């Protein structure tokens with residue numbers, strides 16, 4: 001079972017990162033009753049024990065989902081302690097070691113990932129994701145003053161944001177989903193794109209400049225999809241055929 005082999009590799013990486021100096025503050029969940037403001041600042045807590053339990057629950061079908069959770073450990077420290085705090089440097093040392101090990105094992109990992117999810121090896125899936133990513137970076141992120149939508153809102157800077165927006169979405173998260181080949185057609189991609197606009201309508205109001213910008217992001221997305229419609233339609237058909245064949 002390739003998911004088991006993959007999981008054993010990921011756990012070994014966790015063992016190696018746990019062994020780096022001064023990493024103990026990251027080995028187990030923050031005690032939110034001692035660090036009493038922690039959840040007022042941090043939205044996505046993560047630690048090496050939770051990461052290991054997620055590996056054991058087989059939640060990670062590839063390098064990328066594992067690494068995204070690992071990176072939260074660094075981002076949370078950067079937000080809570082500060083970008084240059086020793087705790088943030090320590091957590092960065094674990095992400096760096098992870099990246100070394102992932103590089104050393106990349107061919108074995110690619111093979112496991114493809115055995116777990118054959119679409120990661122499908123040339124039509126790959127081409128489709130490449131086009132979506134270029135639409136995001138060259139068209140949607142190029143909309144003037146689109147910076148509020150480039151990354152997740154940091155609750156440190158907008159403290160009530162996630163009390164209002166319980167289904168957040170942003171363009172970086174979409175790019176990560178594209179890199180994971182989450183989208184097999186333009187409809188699921190557009191579900192996420194439109195969630196960005198819906199969240200701005202809900203949080204900022206229909207007439208806010210934030211919402212006008214988000215509306216422009218969605219509109220140039222539709223315009224660019226229309227320009228590539230016939231290629232995208234062929235790719236979506238061939239992906240559906242590949243998806244059905246993996247059965």
Ligand SMILES: C[C@@H]1COCCN1c1nc(-c2ccnc3[nH]ccc23)cc(C2([S@](C)(=N)=O)CC2)n1
Nearest residue numbers: 147148149150151152153154157158203204210
């Ligand atoms: C103007 C506020 C205050 O100044 C500090 C940052 N800033 C801000 N706002 C949003 C945002 C997005 C959508 N709708 C919103 N409504 C109100 C704010 C808001 C996003 C972001 C970032 S970030 C720094 N990762 O948090 C880039 C994602 N920063």
